[PDB]
Amino acid sequence: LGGYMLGSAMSRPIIHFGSDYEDRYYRENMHRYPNQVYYRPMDEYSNQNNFVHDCVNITIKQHTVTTTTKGENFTETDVKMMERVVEQMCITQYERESQAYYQR
Numbered sequence: 001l002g003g004y005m006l007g008s009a010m011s012r013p014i015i016h017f018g019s020d021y022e023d024r025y026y027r028e029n030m031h032r033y034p035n036q037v038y039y040r041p042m043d044e045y046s047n048q049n050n051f052v053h054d055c056v057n058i059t060i061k062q063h064t065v066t067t068t069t070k071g072e073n074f075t076e077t078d079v080k081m082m083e084r085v086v087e088q089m090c091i092t093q094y095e096r097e098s099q100a101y102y103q104r
Contacts, residue, residue: 004058007037008096013088017081026081033082037090038062042101052090059086 012030016023026033039055060082064074 001058004038004040007039007055007059007090008093009036010089010092011035013085013092015081015084015088022077022081025077026085029078030085033085034059034063034089037086037093039090039093048091048094048098051094052087055090056083056086059090 012033012035014030015026017026036059037055038059039051045051045054060079063082064079067074
């Protein structure tokens with residue numbers, strides 16, 4: 001961790017995958033997923049998508065570290081599923097501040 005921090009909070013955004021074991025499985029266990037993200041406020045990056053790429057990869061990995069520092073490890077399944085949800089949260093915060101970066 002080279003100097004990231006958290007981002008804002010919201011509702012848990014939903015993303016299908018087209019298969020029961022992914023559409024349902026995320027649903028069963030979204031009650032244990034995040035509700036905030038990890039990023040740095042605009043110091044060095046300003047894409048929409050790629051700003052979220054970095055952020056997501058971090059918030060995600062941080063859940064994996066947090067499990068391992070307790071004595072557990074997530075899977076590719078639980079990680080791919082966060083790549084969706086953390087993204088939507090990182091875009092939804094990006095929007096909610098890039099609104100004010102613009103509207104001035």
